[PDB]
Amino acid sequence: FKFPRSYAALLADWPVVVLGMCTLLIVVCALVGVLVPELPDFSDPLLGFEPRGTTIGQRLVTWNNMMRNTGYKATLANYPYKYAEEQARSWNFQKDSFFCDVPSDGYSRVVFASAGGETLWNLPAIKSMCDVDNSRIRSHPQFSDLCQRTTAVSCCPSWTLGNYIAILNNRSSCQKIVERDVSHTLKLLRTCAKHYQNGTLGPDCWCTNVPRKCTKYNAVYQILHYLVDKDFMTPKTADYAVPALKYSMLFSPTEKGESMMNIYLDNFENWNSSDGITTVTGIEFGIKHSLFQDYLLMDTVYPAIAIAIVLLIMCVYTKSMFITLMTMFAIISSLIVSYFLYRVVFNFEFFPFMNLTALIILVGIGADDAFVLCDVWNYTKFDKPRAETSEAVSVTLQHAALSMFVTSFTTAAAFYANYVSNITAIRCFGVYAGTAILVNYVLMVTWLPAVIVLHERYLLNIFCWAVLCQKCRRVLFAVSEASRIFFEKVLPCIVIKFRYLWLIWFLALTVGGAYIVCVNPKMKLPSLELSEFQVFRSSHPFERYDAEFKKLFMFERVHHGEELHMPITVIWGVSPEDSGDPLNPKSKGELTLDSTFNIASPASQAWILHFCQKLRNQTFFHQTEQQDFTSCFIETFKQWMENQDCDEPALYPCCSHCSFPYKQEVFELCIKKAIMELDRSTGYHLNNKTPGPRFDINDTIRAVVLEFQSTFLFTLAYEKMQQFYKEVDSWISHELSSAPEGLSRGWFVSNLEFYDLQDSLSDGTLIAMGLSVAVAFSVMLLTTWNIIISLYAIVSIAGTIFVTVGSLVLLGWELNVLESVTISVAVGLSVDFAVHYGVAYRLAPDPDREGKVIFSLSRMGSAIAMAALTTFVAGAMMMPSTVLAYTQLGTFMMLVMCVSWAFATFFFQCLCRCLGPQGTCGQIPF
Ligand SMILES: CCCCCCCCCCC(CCCCCCCCCC)(CO[C@@H]1O[C@H](CO)[C@@H](O[C@H]2O[C@H](CO)[C@@H](O)[C@H](O)[C@H]2O)[C@H](O)[C@H]1O)CO[C@@H]1O[C@H](CO)[C@@H](O[C@H]2O[C@H](CO)[C@@H](O)[C@H](O)[C@H]2O)[C@H](O)[C@H]1O
Ligand SMILES: CCCCCCCCCCC(CCCCCCCCCC)(CO[C@@H]1O[C@H](CO)[C@@H](O[C@H]2O[C@H](CO)[C@@H](O)[C@H](O)[C@H]2O)[C@H](O)[C@H]1O)CO[C@@H]1O[C@H](CO)[C@@H](O[C@H]2O[C@H](CO)[C@@H](O)[C@H](O)[C@H]2O)[C@H](O)[C@H]1O
Ligand SMILES: CC(C)CCC[C@@H](C)[C@H]1CC[C@H]2[C@@H]3CC=C4C[C@@H](OC(=O)CCC(=O)O)CC[C@]4(C)[C@H]3CC[C@]12C
Ligand SMILES: CC(C)CCC[C@@H](C)[C@H]1CC[C@H]2[C@@H]3CC=C4C[C@@H](OC(=O)CCC(=O)O)CC[C@]4(C)[C@H]3CC[C@]12C
Ligand SMILES: CC(C)CCC[C@@H](C)[C@H]1CC[C@H]2[C@@H]3CC=C4C[C@@H](OC(=O)CCC(=O)O)CC[C@]4(C)[C@H]3CC[C@]12C
Ligand SMILES: CC(C)CCC[C@@H](C)[C@H]1CC[C@H]2[C@@H]3CC=C4C[C@@H](OC(=O)CCC(=O)O)CC[C@]4(C)[C@H]3CC[C@]12C
Ligand SMILES: CC(C)CCC[C@@H](C)[C@H]1CC[C@H]2[C@@H]3CC=C4C[C@@H](OC(=O)CCC(=O)O)CC[C@]4(C)[C@H]3CC[C@]12C
Ligand SMILES: CC(C)CCC[C@@H](C)[C@H]1CC[C@H]2[C@@H]3CC=C4C[C@@H](OC(=O)CCC(=O)O)CC[C@]4(C)[C@H]3CC[C@]12C
Ligand SMILES: CC(C)CCC[C@@H](C)[C@H]1CC[C@H]2[C@@H]3CC=C4C[C@@H](OC(=O)CCC(=O)O)CC[C@]4(C)[C@H]3CC[C@]12C
Ligand SMILES: CC(C)CCC[C@@H](C)[C@H]1CC[C@H]2[C@@H]3CC=C4C[C@@H](OC(=O)CCC(=O)O)CC[C@]4(C)[C@H]3CC[C@]12C
Ligand SMILES: CC(C)CCC[C@@H](C)[C@H]1CC[C@H]2[C@@H]3CC=C4C[C@@H](OC(=O)CCC(=O)O)CC[C@]4(C)[C@H]3CC[C@]12C
Ligand SMILES: CC(C)CCC[C@@H](C)[C@H]1CC[C@H]2[C@@H]3CC=C4C[C@@H](OC(=O)CCC(=O)O)CC[C@]4(C)[C@H]3CC[C@]12C
Ligand SMILES: CC(C)CCC[C@@H](C)[C@H]1CC[C@H]2[C@@H]3CC=C4C[C@@H](OC(=O)CCC(=O)O)CC[C@]4(C)[C@H]3CC[C@]12C
Ligand SMILES: CC(C)CCC[C@@H](C)[C@H]1CC[C@H]2[C@@H]3CC=C4C[C@@H](OC(=O)CCC(=O)O)CC[C@]4(C)[C@H]3CC[C@]12C
Ligand SMILES: CC(C)CCC[C@@H](C)[C@H]1CC[C@H]2[C@@H]3CC=C4C[C@@H](OC(=O)CCC(=O)O)CC[C@]4(C)[C@H]3CC[C@]12C
Ligand SMILES: *[C@@H]1O[C@H](CO)[C@@H](O)[C@H](O)[C@H]1NC(C)=O
Ligand SMILES: *[C@@H]1O[C@H](CO)[C@@H](O)[C@H](O)[C@H]1NC(C)=O
Ligand SMILES: *[C@@H]1O[C@H](CO)[C@@H](O)[C@H](O)[C@H]1NC(C)=O
Ligand code: NA
Ligand code: NA
């Protein structure tokens, strides 16, 4: 029986086989991907934002596994429990003149600013804050179940300036205060602020150095610590009529969390946030990550609107709704098939929210190849108008199929290069987006050639209205002639005549971009900790709370503060290893004990005391004037032993007569006795963080922990924290290199979670961009076979990247997660227009470099323009989004398209016109 004897004949004779086979295996992917995997969860946006394989990361994971597994009959314990049990065997403020408790981070709260720029310390503003709370939080039908309660009659009062003024001036409520009460309260604040600054006022005094008037309910401490900004009542300009209260805070009796969701959505979300007197500038209801999932899915309307505009661009370009809608079916199918491969074939259990942005990327860059194949098909038709379909298909594929691949492969490879990241979310996103891009290419050389054959065979025969069709035809004709005159006549004259203007202008831009990126101001690393990471645009009240207001209120500053010294924690007997799955963020492994460890050896006892006394001589160590008896438990144990009075027979082994390097059996006996003496002799209680030995279920010491304070303070600056880490880790590693066996495998840990993230963002960006640059230059040598065209192309790609990244630096971008991925992807996208032109310069029949540049611009001009335009339009559609990630990706997509199109069309064609090869001058031998 009959069968097609070549691929071009399969497409030409049986296009319905190709579409039927594609449709069936796409339908299988769509079914199995919904039925078999567990569906994605976006309840935590920050989920994979952690380095896994790093030296610091494995130590941090190990220390967390030690802390969870430490406790009564757990894997490790602070106390020798099997020895210990053997010892045991032997409203109206004139009536209810109080608030229900102290305000805290546990309560729902809002930040006010003045609407007219006034000081907030005025009676209209003070009552307007109470009016907003009453009208927007309390009024809600759910509030009465959520509020903390002293009686069934009414909820507790909210912590607000007007209620503190009421209780200080014996008024019944915020609503019944007067200007005399406001000025009286201002005097009390102005005098007693020095007592608060000097640490003499405090939370419980209702303060022996402090006068009674401002002690009256702890009200002056509570106003200054919780309700007012840090510039109000600062020592400078305190003698001023009313000080500038820029911001003030209000606390609701509702506990901060997911119960606030209805109150927010009903009464805060759609509001204009202003009472005309005061504006609500910040909100902290505990719902930021709960709200994130809703907006993350709701904003998928913007990529859907982008699909319709890309359908319009491509319907006018190709002149069919058939080839156009079948191309957009293939674009959306490549996401569905990528998802089946990702969850079912590759077995990835975690789907980051970053993966939803691959719908934006594929809608922008998906049609690029359809514009190329449709052009080449029409050049092929025009060149040989009586060729049979199998010849026309084969010639079209011979001209198009490699350039379509190289532009796709450069962009997929730039995403797969992010699998070299230590950050789990970045690796997962690189795999998902790289796979969709390659699946889309396979459809553009299978599905789209068979669709083009079916159009020509049937639909090309079939295809006010009686004038509207004619009016449509004549305007479509005029648009196409205008497009042809531009790309064949207008644009080549502008490129060639002004070539010396272009060479000077685009070099000046490249030098400017290189100065901004490499000299000043450079791109910065992240400057907020991971819990404060921005998910919404900076306009959103939840983001202004974390970015602006957490640093202006004293209770939010002292939650960590400036005088945190870095701990130096040193651990033995546990292996610093992550045995969990690095691609599953929830898979932390199992705690591993080191079988070679021994503390109780006389050599181990002697060395570890000498290490403690060596470490105290270093410039990184901070001497507290009170001694830490926990820091080096061996010195405290030596001290206890040399105090045992030894006249009692029970003190026979644990005696002051013994010299310090005790025989191992006397160490193992007396350490248990000394630990059990402590919690009876003193009020001191050990916990899973406390330094000391760690016992197993057979009262055997399996680990030891030492801890010391550093002269280094805690900081979010990368270089200061790198200097701390290098100085301490080098000295500890060097000193441990001379430790006896059984102490040789110890390791150092500290508060280094954010420094490990910053370090991983630095390293992974440099590696992924170097891999992306290597692929970009390689594929251009292998596509042009000429070193001079490949060189002018990589110089234009370099100018594109310096102007693109230098522009993002002037826009205030930092090297965060996602921002770091776009830098790698910028290279792989920027390849594409210089490849399309560089192949058309070589293809040119003209002998002279001017004719070859006119040919190149004439033949690739409108396809390059349409690929740039569809990618720009997809990015421009993401600007109404609340999700920060959508708005950042669309910003990048617009910017990189303008810069890469201009450098490929003006700068790279001007290099080819001035000093381009002619007559095989730089041709690589095959
Ligand atoms: C691959 C990823 C798959 C993700 C799967 C999860 C999808 C979750 C969908 C969620 C969602 C978007 C729908 C668009 C999705 C496009 C996907 C494109 C995928 C391409 C591969 C469902 O939108 C639904 O739309 C229905 C339309 O028929 C509508 O039906 C109703 O009318 C029928 C007659 O029309 C009638 O018969 C039926 O009885 C009715 O009920 C529903 O009530 C409505 O809930 C949520 O948005 C809904 O609609 C608005 C949208 O703007 C949204 O507007 C706000 O927010 C926008 C955004 O922040 C912002 O822009 C807007 O300014 C802002 O006002 C609304 O607040 C929200 O309510
Ligand atoms: C596994 C890790 C164990 C961690 C232990 C951590 C707790 C410290 C225990 C050690 C301990 C008692 C001995 C108990 C048994 C020890 C078993 C050891 C087991 C080891 C396996 C040693 O007490 C020290 O004894 C020394 C003699 O031995 C003595 O030395 C002197 O003599 C020599 C010159 O004449 C020469 O030595 C040296 O120059 C001299 O100074 C010191 O003055 C004295 O401070 C502490 O005793 C007391 O503890 C109190 C709180 O309970 C603590 O109260 C304060 O701080 C509280 C807040 O913490 C706070 O609330 C209180 O308001 C506040 O008042 C006292 O200030 C402290 O004194
Ligand atoms: C998920 C669903 C859509 C999967 C099912 C796909 C089917 C609808 C496809 C698969 C193979 C296709 C067939 C493949 C080849 C042909 C031969 C074709 O005719 C010829 O090539 C000319 C024969 C002649 O000499 O007359 C007519 C359509 C037909 C029957 C196709 C009809 C549609 C079929 C059955
Ligand atoms: C954005 C994605 C989800 C689009 C998915 C499209 C599919 C549902 C396919 C299957 C059947 C296709 C239709 C089959 C036949 C025709 C007739 C065809 O008529 C002509 O050929 C008009 C002139 C021309 O377009 O060249 C126009 C497209 C249309 C409606 C096709 C459009 C695309 C359809 C709806
Ligand atoms: C990246 C783009 C191109 C689409 C990728 C494949 C889709 C088939 C996935 C991606 C996100 C998924 C959605 C993300 C979140 C949800 C909520 C989820 O349910 C829960 O989260 C329930 C609450 C909980 O688990 O606690 C299941 C449906 C749905 C819409 C998922 C259905 C399948 C979706 C659309
Ligand atoms: C994971 C998947 C997506 C990888 C897919 C890779 C292929 C699509 C690449 C690899 C090698 C490429 C081929 C290498 C060599 C050629 C010969 C080339 O030149 C000719 O046929 C010579 C005659 C002429 O140019 O007219 C046409 C393109 C083609 C088939 C290339 C098309 C694209 C191919 C098949
Ligand atoms: C999941 C799988 C199916 C992905 C792999 C798809 C391949 C089977 C496709 C991708 C590109 C295609 C090629 C694109 C271009 C050409 C050139 C074309 O012409 C020549 O080879 C002419 C050579 C000469 O003139 O000497 C023949 C078909 C061929 C090899 C195609 C055959 C089928 C290829 C290799
Ligand atoms: C493979 C073909 C299609 C060439 C693709 C271009 C290559 C130059 C690049 C693109 C993506 C790169 C890969 C992206 C990520 C990684 C993970 C990286 O992992 C590790 O070093 C740690 C071990 C691990 O986690 O697997 C090893 C190199 C590798 C495979 C890279 C090797 C070089 C690759 C294949
Ligand atoms: C989203 C809203 C607010 C604005 C959408 C405007 C678009 C519908 C306009 C803007 C630019 C226009 C395009 C400008 C240039 C061209 C190239 C032109 O190319 C050809 O005539 C040559 C085709 C070939 O060589 O075969 C076809 C029309 C097209 C796609 C135009 C179609 C209509 C477009 C996409
Ligand atoms: C800094 C960015 C905008 C660089 C990327 C785009 C520019 C290279 C474009 C944008 C607007 C263009 C200009 C718009 C209009 C004209 C008038 C035009 O006048 C003629 O007489 C043209 C005659 C012809 O060649 O048909 C000469 C080129 C020029 C300056 C264009 C040169 C190329 C420009 C500067
Ligand atoms: C080869 C051509 C094609 C492109 C070359 C561009 C690169 C040299 C640029 C682009 C982005 C730059 C990176 C962007 C941000 C940073 C953070 C920076 O970290 C810091 O300590 C900054 C100060 C801080 O905030 O603490 C280290 C360099 C690095 C990786 C930059 C190094 C230089 C890079 C890789
Ligand atoms: C020609 C095509 C391809 C692009 C058209 C893009 C415009 C329709 C965009 C560009 C900037 C957008 C604006 C940028 C910012 C905002 C603020 C935004 O304010 C919010 O408080 C709600 C959403 C959010 O959280 O950001 C409301 C939409 C709006 C006016 C956007 C409306 C749509 C605009 C005008
Ligand atoms: C979106 C960013 C990434 C840039 C993408 C490339 C654009 C610079 C291209 C896309 C479509 C092009 C347009 C398509 C058609 C025309 C009509 C053309 O009209 C004539 O030359 C008419 C001459 C006559 O009839 O007298 C003038 C240029 C223009 C606007 C083109 C200018 C270059 C455009 C805007
Ligand atoms: C086609 C390319 C190669 C040439 C330039 C095209 C321009 C239309 C674009 C591309 C990048 C844009 C720039 C990207 C970033 C910024 C920073 C932006 O903000 C600031 O400078 C804020 C300064 C501060 O707050 O202190 C002002 C506009 C500017 C210079 C943009 C102006 C218009 C530029 C040069
Ligand atoms: C060794 C490391 C640094 C990797 C180098 C990779 C490429 C940059 C090398 C590999 C082969 C080299 C080519 C081998 C042969 C030639 C032919 C040579 O002469 C001609 O084309 C003109 C001959 C004439 O005079 O007629 C010009 C340099 C070129 C393209 C070489 C330029 C550099 C190439 C592309
Ligand atoms: C209050 O401040 C002064 C000046 O800094 C200081 O000398 C004094 O000791 C402080 N008061 C108390 C009770 O410590
Ligand atoms: C809207 O905002 C203004 C201040 O810009 C405020 O005066 C007004 O009361 C708000 N509400 C309404 C319904 O206008
Ligand atoms: C600590 O430094 C002093 C002063 O140099 C020295 O006498 C002492 O021996 C050092 N102690 C240790 C344990 O290194
Ligand atoms: Na491509
Ligand atoms: Na590319």
mmCIF file of C-alpha atoms in Angstrom, residues 27-182:
data_model
loop_
_atom_site.group_PDB
_atom_site.id
_atom_site.type_symbol
_atom_site.label_atom_id
_atom_site.label_comp_id
_atom_site.label_asym_id
_atom_site.label_seq_id
_atom_site.Cartn_x
_atom_site.Cartn_y
_atom_site.Cartn_z
ATOM 1 C CA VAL A 27 -4.961 15.711 24.278
ATOM 2 C CA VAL A 28 -3.129 12.924 26.193
ATOM 3 C CA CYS A 29 -0.820 15.559 27.796
ATOM 4 C CA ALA A 30 -3.819 17.778 28.719
ATOM 5 C CA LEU A 31 -5.734 14.840 30.325
ATOM 6 C CA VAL A 32 -2.795 13.170 32.144
ATOM 7 C CA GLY A 33 -1.448 16.542 33.421
ATOM 8 C CA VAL A 34 -4.845 17.292 35.110
ATOM 9 C CA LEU A 35 -5.713 13.726 36.270
ATOM 10 C CA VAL A 36 -2.343 12.323 37.536
ATOM 11 C CA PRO A 37 -0.238 15.093 39.298
ATOM 12 C CA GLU A 38 -1.320 17.010 42.428
ATOM 13 C CA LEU A 39 -2.322 20.554 41.279
ATOM 14 C CA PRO A 40 0.047 23.533 42.068
ATOM 15 C CA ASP A 41 -0.201 25.455 45.388
ATOM 16 C CA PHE A 42 0.709 29.192 45.676
ATOM 17 C CA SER A 43 -0.017 29.648 49.451
ATOM 18 C CA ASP A 44 3.648 30.678 50.054
ATOM 19 C CA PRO A 45 5.194 32.979 47.369
ATOM 20 C CA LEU A 46 8.624 32.784 49.027
ATOM 21 C CA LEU A 47 8.711 28.948 48.990
ATOM 22 C CA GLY A 48 11.883 27.964 47.054
ATOM 23 C CA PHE A 49 13.853 31.223 47.755
ATOM 24 C CA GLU A 50 16.588 29.373 49.635
ATOM 25 C CA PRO A 51 20.079 28.216 48.492
ATOM 26 C CA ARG A 52 20.312 24.437 49.046
ATOM 27 C CA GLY A 53 23.758 23.026 48.113
ATOM 28 C CA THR A 54 25.947 25.857 49.558
ATOM 29 C CA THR A 55 28.466 25.380 52.439
ATOM 30 C CA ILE A 56 26.554 27.878 54.632
ATOM 31 C CA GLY A 57 23.152 26.415 53.544
ATOM 32 C CA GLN A 58 24.051 22.811 54.521
ATOM 33 C CA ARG A 59 25.242 24.054 57.943
ATOM 34 C CA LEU A 60 22.061 26.128 58.466
ATOM 35 C CA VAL A 61 19.827 23.132 57.500
ATOM 36 C CA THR A 62 21.883 20.876 59.839
ATOM 37 C CA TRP A 63 21.445 23.276 62.788
ATOM 38 C CA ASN A 64 17.648 23.451 62.167
ATOM 39 C CA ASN A 65 17.454 19.603 62.047
ATOM 40 C CA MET A 66 19.396 19.518 65.390
ATOM 41 C CA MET A 67 16.956 21.988 67.021
ATOM 42 C CA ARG A 68 13.720 20.189 66.018
ATOM 43 C CA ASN A 69 15.119 16.782 67.044
ATOM 44 C CA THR A 70 16.329 18.013 70.516
ATOM 45 C CA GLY A 71 14.008 17.327 73.515
ATOM 46 C CA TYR A 72 12.603 14.727 75.987
ATOM 47 C CA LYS A 73 13.225 11.230 74.448
ATOM 48 C CA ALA A 74 14.075 12.845 71.035
ATOM 49 C CA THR A 75 17.253 12.042 68.954
ATOM 50 C CA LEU A 76 19.268 14.489 71.145
ATOM 51 C CA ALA A 77 18.619 15.977 74.626
ATOM 52 C CA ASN A 78 20.070 18.714 76.893
ATOM 53 C CA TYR A 79 19.783 16.420 79.984
ATOM 54 C CA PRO A 80 20.827 12.756 80.589
ATOM 55 C CA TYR A 81 17.135 11.805 81.100
ATOM 56 C CA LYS A 82 17.646 8.020 81.721
ATOM 57 C CA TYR A 83 20.062 9.017 84.555
ATOM 58 C CA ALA A 84 17.643 11.798 85.748
ATOM 59 C CA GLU A 85 14.598 9.443 86.056
ATOM 60 C CA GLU A 86 16.822 7.096 88.164
ATOM 61 C CA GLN A 87 17.307 10.111 90.541
ATOM 62 C CA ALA A 88 13.536 10.884 90.550
ATOM 63 C CA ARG A 89 13.024 7.184 91.591
ATOM 64 C CA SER A 90 14.756 7.956 94.976
ATOM 65 C CA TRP A 91 -16.439 50.870 75.818
ATOM 66 C CA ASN A 92 -16.261 53.597 78.538
ATOM 67 C CA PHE A 93 -12.829 54.615 79.970
ATOM 68 C CA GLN A 94 -14.534 56.350 82.986
ATOM 69 C CA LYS A 95 -15.951 52.881 84.020
ATOM 70 C CA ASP A 96 -13.649 50.309 82.339
ATOM 71 C CA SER A 97 -10.602 52.579 82.893
ATOM 72 C CA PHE A 98 -8.062 50.200 81.201
ATOM 73 C CA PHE A 99 -7.046 48.609 77.865
ATOM 74 C CA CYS A 100 -7.425 44.770 77.759
ATOM 75 C CA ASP A 101 -3.638 44.222 77.185
ATOM 76 C CA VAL A 102 -0.453 45.867 75.706
ATOM 77 C CA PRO A 103 -0.391 46.479 71.867
ATOM 78 C CA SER A 104 1.967 44.165 69.873
ATOM 79 C CA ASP A 105 2.922 42.688 66.465
ATOM 80 C CA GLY A 106 0.200 40.016 67.082
ATOM 81 C CA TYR A 107 -2.618 42.539 66.357
ATOM 82 C CA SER A 108 -4.015 43.832 63.024
ATOM 83 C CA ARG A 109 -2.858 47.445 62.376
ATOM 84 C CA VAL A 110 -2.785 50.390 59.929
ATOM 85 C CA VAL A 111 -0.453 53.387 59.397
ATOM 86 C CA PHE A 112 -1.859 56.869 58.824
ATOM 87 C CA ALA A 113 -0.203 59.844 57.125
ATOM 88 C CA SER A 114 -1.659 63.403 56.867
ATOM 89 C CA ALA A 115 -3.656 64.012 53.640
ATOM 90 C CA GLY A 116 -2.762 67.786 53.510
ATOM 91 C CA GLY A 117 0.859 67.347 54.796
ATOM 92 C CA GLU A 118 0.029 68.678 58.337
ATOM 93 C CA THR A 119 1.461 67.231 61.570
ATOM 94 C CA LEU A 120 -0.862 64.294 62.522
ATOM 95 C CA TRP A 121 -0.875 65.713 66.108
ATOM 96 C CA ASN A 122 -4.168 67.666 65.634
ATOM 97 C CA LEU A 123 -7.746 66.973 66.862
ATOM 98 C CA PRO A 124 -9.318 66.474 63.341
ATOM 99 C CA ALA A 125 -6.593 63.920 62.450
ATOM 100 C CA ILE A 126 -6.728 62.171 65.881
ATOM 101 C CA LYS A 127 -10.542 61.642 65.661
ATOM 102 C CA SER A 128 -10.335 60.799 61.888
ATOM 103 C CA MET A 129 -8.140 57.785 62.812
ATOM 104 C CA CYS A 130 -10.857 56.592 65.272
ATOM 105 C CA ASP A 131 -13.541 57.299 62.590
ATOM 106 C CA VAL A 132 -11.741 55.065 60.016
ATOM 107 C CA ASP A 133 -11.372 52.200 62.569
ATOM 108 C CA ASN A 134 -15.050 52.422 63.622
ATOM 109 C CA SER A 135 -16.374 52.746 60.027
ATOM 110 C CA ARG A 136 -14.046 50.201 58.295
ATOM 111 C CA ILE A 137 -12.996 47.484 60.836
ATOM 112 C CA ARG A 138 -15.629 47.394 63.633
ATOM 113 C CA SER A 139 -18.652 47.985 61.359
ATOM 114 C CA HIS A 140 -17.944 44.672 59.533
ATOM 115 C CA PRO A 141 -20.408 41.769 60.319
ATOM 116 C CA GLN A 142 -17.519 39.341 61.127
ATOM 117 C CA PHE A 143 -15.597 41.635 63.579
ATOM 118 C CA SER A 144 -17.653 40.745 66.703
ATOM 119 C CA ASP A 145 -16.489 37.067 66.489
ATOM 120 C CA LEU A 146 -12.787 37.972 65.875
ATOM 121 C CA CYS A 147 -12.205 40.642 68.586
ATOM 122 C CA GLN A 148 -10.536 39.833 71.950
ATOM 123 C CA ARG A 149 -13.201 40.034 74.701
ATOM 124 C CA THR A 150 -13.583 41.013 78.433
ATOM 125 C CA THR A 151 -17.474 40.864 78.177
ATOM 126 C CA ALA A 152 -20.249 39.641 75.819
ATOM 127 C CA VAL A 153 -21.617 43.283 75.772
ATOM 128 C CA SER A 154 -18.783 44.823 73.637
ATOM 129 C CA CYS A 155 -15.271 44.122 72.251
ATOM 130 C CA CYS A 156 -12.054 45.548 73.789
ATOM 131 C CA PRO A 157 -11.044 49.146 72.723
ATOM 132 C CA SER A 158 -8.441 49.692 69.921
ATOM 133 C CA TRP A 159 -5.001 51.196 70.678
ATOM 134 C CA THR A 160 -5.183 54.678 69.038
ATOM 135 C CA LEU A 161 -3.978 58.202 70.088
ATOM 136 C CA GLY A 162 -7.582 59.353 70.762
ATOM 137 C CA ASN A 163 -8.180 56.535 73.313
ATOM 138 C CA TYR A 164 -4.845 57.267 75.098
ATOM 139 C CA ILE A 165 -5.830 60.979 75.209
ATOM 140 C CA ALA A 166 -9.272 59.924 76.571
ATOM 141 C CA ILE A 167 -7.871 57.651 79.366
ATOM 142 C CA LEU A 168 -5.168 60.261 80.342
ATOM 143 C CA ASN A 169 -7.831 63.043 80.567
ATOM 144 C CA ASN A 170 -10.639 60.858 82.113
ATOM 145 C CA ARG A 171 -12.918 61.197 79.012
ATOM 146 C CA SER A 172 -15.194 58.192 78.284
ATOM 147 C CA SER A 173 -13.994 57.642 74.635
ATOM 148 C CA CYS A 174 -11.895 58.983 71.683
ATOM 149 C CA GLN A 175 -14.996 60.811 70.315
ATOM 150 C CA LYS A 176 -15.368 63.036 73.475
ATOM 151 C CA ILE A 177 -11.780 64.445 73.783
ATOM 152 C CA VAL A 178 -11.095 68.236 73.316
ATOM 153 C CA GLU A 179 -8.105 70.519 72.412
ATOM 154 C CA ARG A 180 -7.225 70.978 76.153
ATOM 155 C CA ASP A 181 -6.717 67.166 76.395
ATOM 156 C CA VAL A 182 -4.566 67.144 73.205
#
